[PDB]
Amino acid sequence: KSAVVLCMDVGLAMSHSNQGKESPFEQAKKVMMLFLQRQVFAESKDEIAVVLYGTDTTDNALAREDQYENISVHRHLMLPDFDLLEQIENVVEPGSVQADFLDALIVSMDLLQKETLGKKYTRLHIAVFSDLSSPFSVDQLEVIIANLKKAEITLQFFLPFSVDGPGKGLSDQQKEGIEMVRKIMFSLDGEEGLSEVFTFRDSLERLSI
């Protein structure tokens, strides 16, 4: 069994619908639902948590005055079920704020650290879905990376656009986020780590690998 956190950006920018028929929020929710359905129908023993960032309310163990705001643990590290499918389909809505993705990463890491205690997993995994529109702080990022390595956590980033035809009108903040993702993945896995950065279009199959 593996332990997976789906770390999903639900911030306001994700709701903007200007590519195809679905906004990035709708696309990411669909992938999440299809993945969870696959896991349920297959009777997989993997445990799957869901952390949302950009939520209007805050609900996580690290939250305090000005810390880890607008990040919510929607599902703890457990086998998935149909209640979760129903819960995600009808509850998970776009947020009206933005949040710091490295705060969300830390919340996800803390969730794994606590809830895998004393148990054996084949891998620990965090999959981030985001358009990288939100600002973030790099404070103590070197410690985040050190702890990702120590815990042997694998990281995947999924974006609603390619980062390799016409340019796609990415903001400076999105370009900064892309570069930071590249810095993190290179820090974890060198050149091979940069290959762990994917599109929403490819995300469902890359999760199942």
């Binding site: 710091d100 490295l102 890491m109 803390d110 404070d139 410690v143």
Partner: peptide, 12 residues
């Protein structure tokens, strides 16, 4: 830069 406070286990 905005300072964050990491959980104690990360600072071990």
């Amino acid at each position: 830069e905005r300072k964050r406070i990491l959980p104690t286990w990360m600072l071990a």
